[PDB]
Amino acid sequence: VKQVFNFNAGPSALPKPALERAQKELLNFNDTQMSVMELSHRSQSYEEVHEQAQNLLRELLQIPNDYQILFLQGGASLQFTMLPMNLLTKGTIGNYVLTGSWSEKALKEAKLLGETHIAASTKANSYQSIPDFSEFQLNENDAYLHITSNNTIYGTQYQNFPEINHAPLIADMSSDILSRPLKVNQFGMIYAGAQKNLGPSGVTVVIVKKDLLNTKVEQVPTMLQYATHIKSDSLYNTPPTFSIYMLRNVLDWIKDLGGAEAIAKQNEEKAKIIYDTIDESNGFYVGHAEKGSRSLMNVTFNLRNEELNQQFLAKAKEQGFVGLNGHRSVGGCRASIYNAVPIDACIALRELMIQFKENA
Amino acid sequence: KQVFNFNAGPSALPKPALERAQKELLNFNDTQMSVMELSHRSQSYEEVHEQAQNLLRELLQIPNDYQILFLQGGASLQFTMLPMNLLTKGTIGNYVLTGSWSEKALKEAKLLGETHIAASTKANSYQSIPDFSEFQLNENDAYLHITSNNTIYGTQYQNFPEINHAPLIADMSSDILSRPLKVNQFGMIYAGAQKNLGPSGVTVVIVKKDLLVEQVPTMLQYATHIKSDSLYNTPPTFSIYMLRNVLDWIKDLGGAEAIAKQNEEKAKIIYDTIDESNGFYVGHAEKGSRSLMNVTFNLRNEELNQQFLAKAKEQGFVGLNGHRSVGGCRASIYNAVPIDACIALRELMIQFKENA
Ligand SMILES: *Cc1c(COP(=O)(O)O)cnc(C)c1O
Ligand SMILES: *Cc1c(COP(=O)(O)O)cnc(C)c1O
Ligand SMILES: [Cl-]
Ligand SMILES: [Cl-]
Ligand SMILES: [Cl-]
Ligand SMILES: [Cl-]
Ligand SMILES: [Mg+2]
Numbered sequence: 001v002k003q004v005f006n007f008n009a010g011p012s013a014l015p016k017p018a019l020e021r022a023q024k025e026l027l028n029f030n031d032t033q034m035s036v037m038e039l040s041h042r043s044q045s046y047e048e049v050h051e052q053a054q055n056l057l058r059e060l061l062q063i064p065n066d067y068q069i070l071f072l073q074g075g076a077s078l079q080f081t082m083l084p085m086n087l088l089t090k091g092t093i094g095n096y097v098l099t100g101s102w103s104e105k106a107l108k109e110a111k112l113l114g115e116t117h118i119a120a121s122t123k124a125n126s127y128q129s130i131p132d133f134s135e136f137q138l139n140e141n142d143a144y145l146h147i148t149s150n151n152t153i154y155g156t157q158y159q160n161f162p163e164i165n166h167a168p169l170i171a172d173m174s175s176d177i178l179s180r181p182l183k184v185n186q187f188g189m190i191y192a193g194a195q196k197n198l199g200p201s202g203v204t205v206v207i208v209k210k211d212l213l214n215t216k217v218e219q220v221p222t223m224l225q226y227a228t229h230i231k232s233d234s235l236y237n238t239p240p241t242f243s244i245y246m247l248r249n250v251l252d253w254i255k256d257l258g259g260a261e262a263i264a265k266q267n268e269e270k271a272k273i274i275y276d277t278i279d280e281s282n283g284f285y286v287g288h289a290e291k292g293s294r295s296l297m298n299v300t301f302n303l304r305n306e307e308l309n310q311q312f313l314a315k316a317k318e319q320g321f322v323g324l325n326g327h328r329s330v331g332g333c334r335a336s337i338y339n340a341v342p343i344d345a346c347i348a349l350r351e352l353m354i355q356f357k358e359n360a
Numbered sequence: 361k362q363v364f365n366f367n368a369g370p371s372a373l374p375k376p377a378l379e380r381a382q383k384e385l386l387n388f389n390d391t392q393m394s395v396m397e398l399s400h401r402s403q404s405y406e407e408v409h410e411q412a413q414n415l416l417r418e419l420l421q422i423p424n425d426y427q428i429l430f431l432q433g434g435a436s437l438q439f440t441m442l443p444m445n446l447l448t449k450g451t452i453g454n455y456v457l458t459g460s461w462s463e464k465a466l467k468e469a470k471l472l473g474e475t476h477i478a479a480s481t482k483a484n485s486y487q488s489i490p491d492f493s494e495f496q497l498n499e500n501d502a503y504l505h506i507t508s509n510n511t512i513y514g515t516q517y518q519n520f521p522e523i524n525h526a527p528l529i530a531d532m533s534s535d536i537l538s539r540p541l542k543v544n545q546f547g548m549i550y551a552g553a554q555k556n557l558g559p560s561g562v563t564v565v566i567v568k569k570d571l572l573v574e575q576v577p578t579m580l581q582y583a584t585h586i587k588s589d590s591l592y593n594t595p596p597t598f599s600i601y602m603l604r605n606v607l608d609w610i611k612d613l614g615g616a617e618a619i620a621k622q623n624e625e626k627a628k629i630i631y632d633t634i635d636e637s638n639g640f641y642v643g644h645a646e647k648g649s650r651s652l653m654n655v656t657f658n659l660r661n662e663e664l665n666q667q668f669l670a671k672a673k674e675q676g677f678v679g680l681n682g683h684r685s686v687g688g689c690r691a692s693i694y695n696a697v698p699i700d701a702c703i704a705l706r707e708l709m710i711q712f713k714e715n716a
């Protein structure tokens with residue numbers, strides 16, 4: 001039929017082969033004559049999937065053997081409270097770097113549970129940049145330092161990660177995990193809802209330094225202890241089996257295209273197509289982020305006034321573009337260009353942008 | 361290539377629901393995207409989300425003063441979320457123990473507050489549901505918690521107690537929407553979807569609105585989810601889509617009364633087989649408490665038990681091993697398990713007994 005270009009911000013485009021693979025075996029997985037959704041998570045067919053998803057992640061991000069990979073329910077949002085529940089102990093401080101709205105939501109949950117601090121923030125200038133690491137106010141009693149690697153709503157992204165030795169570095173990488181190579185040992189824990197760059201909603205990937213958190217925390221509900229899930233290999237209670245399966249399929253696809261290094265090359269190219277369009281528009285389109293902080297995953301911009309914003313977004317939607325409206329809290333536009341968004345979608349968006357500009 | 365899916369959780373689903381999912385997996389509702397590729401704030405997703413709630417409301421006849429929530433974390437997270445929200449200081453989380461899942465729920469409440477056992481059949485290894493006249497209730501109960509179907513032990517509430525001093529709360533994971541319900545008896549009902557309603561990944565919570573909060577994490581307040589219509593954060597969109605599909609199948613076959621007829625025939629096939637076996641097969645549950653959802657039984661000794669389960673597996677039956685905590689055999693016959701599978705089981709049971 002007509003064209004559809006999927007710029008949804010979360011859940012988002014999946015790579016076609018992962019969906020085609022799921023479709024073909026939806027009723028009969030691994031010759032069992034059952035859907036993967038109808039299997040016991042204690043079945044060997046399921047355990048294979050569960051283990052493969054872990055091994056693919058391990059290989060793709062080169063995760064060290066002293067880290068474990070958890071598959072949890074509850075979204076990144078549940079991790080906002082689970083993290084301080086496990087690590088924010090009395091006399092310690094949950095230290096946060098604020099670089100957007102998702103950083104503020106993380107902070108707020110820690111405030112419910114303990115002492116917090118703000119190491120650095122670009123909130124005053126509306127989160128157009130990542131603060132300089134030299135500006136980080138660190139405390140000797142910090143339980144951890146928490147960052148948001150990619151600020152989904154504001155379109156900014158860490159180019160690199162701070163060296164932190166006094167506390168574990170924790171990162172919400174929901175919207176850029178496995179979009180590029182990562183030195184995992186810079187961190188004590190990384191978490192990501194899968195629905196932005198790794199597959200479906202319903203599972204949250206948590207990569208954790210085992211010794212930071214494989215120990216029981218007194219007074220914490222069993223389901224809310226990392227230790228519980230580490231010990232049981234994310235099989236303490238029933239896992240989201242279809243979500244983990246789809247995650248596996250998506251990871252297989254990333255591996256098939258050459259891994260993190262190859263997908264970074266693709267992601268830089270798609271992003272360049274859109275930012276060059278903005279940058280050659282003589283101010284018709286204005287990116288929110290400062291150039292040194294531009295996200296490769298979420299491209300945020302405005303036209304010169306809200307009327308043009310609305311006409312542009314209405315024209316997009318009529319031409320088959322999905323998800324370009326900015327987050328409700330900030331307005332404007334947001335082109336989400338996660339791993340699986342195809343480059344011709346990006347070219348199509350550029351075409352749209354240029355004709356709208358020329359005809360305005 | 362004959363397979364009979366008696367898995368206990370996750371479990372068989374209706375073929376029409378899975379076929380419908382397969383057909384539109386790449387192109388949902390002519391959007392040219394998977395349901396999995398939609399924003400949860402899209403109208404496209406929002407209609408599915410609402411349709412799943414609407415179907416549950418219709419099928420269980422849920423009154424207007426109840427809200428239907430779709431949460432992550434399984435029934436296991438509800439074990440702690442419930443007392444987190446309702447077990448206020450100077451109140452008591454009161455539990456009726458009818459199996460190991462009851463025990464797991466009570467354990468989480470003990471972390472957070474005062475608990476109590478209203479009644480328990482544990483001493484007799486959970487062969488029955490206690491008499492309601494036996495319950496020990498307290499003026500300051502925050503709630504009375506029960507497990508409607510005791511998945512590991514194969515017993516089930518025939519009816520529910522009339523409780524007015526505190527909200528009645530029920531873990532219905534393994535029998536929700538297997539029969540009509542009087543939802544007004546309860547302040548809250550919860551269930552992982554993965555037994556009777558859908559795939560794993562979503563938990564259905566039916567809650568009396570005005571029943572349910574300083575200092576509880578945002579994600580763990582029922583009020584968060586009630587206020588946001590279970591769209592506070594990203595829901596498990598595909599699981600809710602599949603739940604809708606399963607609910608459409610139940611509606612299409614005639615609703616809660618119709619599925620109860622099927623379920624009672626399924627259970628009748630197995631229990632009759634056991635009762636007519638002259639002691640070769642022995643059911644764990646007392647007759648009066650027999651579950652329609654999980655049929656638990658053993659052969660006369662461990663070696664015959666093992667021989668039977670081996671023969672079963674060879675013949676294409678899946679999931680019949682009993683829970684590791686109790687051994688024996690367990691035939692889970694949730695909504696989507698077809699009558700033909702239970703007939704096959706019967707015939708295998710009869711042949712095995714003849715050939716022993
Ligand atoms: C989407 C998003 C979240 C929210 O994830 P949920 O799974 O909806 O809780 C949190 N952090 C970031 C950076 C996000 O982009
Ligand atoms: C399966 C089951 C549970 C566990 O559900 P999860 O989704 O695995 O947490 C809890 N209670 C009962 C009665 C069950 O049958
Ligand atoms: Cl943000
Ligand atoms: Cl977002
Ligand atoms: Cl039980
Ligand atoms: Cl069980
Ligand atoms: Mg491959």
Ligand SMILES: [Mg+2]
Nearest residue numbers: 342343344345
């Ligand atoms: Mg193309």
Ligand SMILES: [Mg+2]
Nearest residue numbers: 608609611612
């Ligand atoms: Mg219909």
Ligand SMILES: [Mg+2]
Nearest residue numbers: 632633635636
């Ligand atoms: Mg008879």
